[PDB]
């Protein structure tokens, strides 16, 4: 500020980049001004007994949700392992590349299965209007909400 070096030597994205669910709310593993590139790993449920197929739809942004952040990509996740209710699985896996580009790469982990969308960032560019207006109320006031909507339509499911 009064102090002549406002700098930050970080390759951060300026949100916090999850994904819109079940009955469209977040789930955020990343975080506000984070140093991508990097993989995180959120381990989601299912709804019926043995094998439902998950509708992930990735939004960059959102307060205790369906407000109205940035939505890019969407992907849909089938050949799950039949278990009874609320323990069939899934991660919901987050491989950010340098330049703010989401690889989202749905898991059926314990049948070693995945398909993945790369979001490339080009429409939108909310830069510091929604992010600072955003962010601020969403992210930090959004796992502070107490993994605000996480505790969704199964225990952890996007189904």
């Given at each position: 500020s009064e102090n002549v070096q406002d700098l930050l030597l970080l390759d951060v994205t300026p949100l916090?980049?999850?994904?819109?669910?079940?009955?469209?709310?977040m789930t955020v593993l990343i975080k506000r001004n984070t140093t991508i590139p990097t993989k995180q790993t959120q381990t989601f449920?299912?709804?019926?007994?043995?094998?439902?197929?998950?509708?992930?739809?990735?939004?960059?942004?959102?307060?205790?949700?369906?407000?109205?952040?940035?939505?890019?990509?969407?992907?849909?996740?089938?050949?799950?392992?039949?278990a009874p209710r609320g323990v069939p699985q899934i991660e919901v896996t987050f491989d950010i590349d340098a330049n703010g580009i989401l690889n989202v790469s749905a898991v059926d982990k314990s049948t070693g299965k995945e398909n993945k969308i790369?979001?490339?960032?080009?429409?939108?560019?909310?830069?510091?209007?929604?992010?600072?207006?955003?962010?601020?109320?969403?992210?930090?006031?959004?796992?502070?909400?107490?993994?605000?909507?996480?505790?969704?339509s199964s225990k952890n499911s996007l189904e």
């Open positions: 916090s980049l999850g994904i819109e669910t079940a009955g469209g709310v449920t299912t709804y019926s007994d043995n094998q439902p197929g998950v509708l992930i739809q990735v939004y960059e942004g959102e307060r205790a949700m369906t407000k109205d952040n940035n939505l890019l990509g969407k992907f849909e996740l089938t050949g799950i392992p039949p790369t979001i490339t960032n080009d429409k939108g560019r909310l830069s510091k209007e929604d992010i600072e207006r955003m962010v601020q109320e969403a992210e930090k006031y959004k796992a502070e909400d107490e993994k605000q909507r996480d505790k969704v």
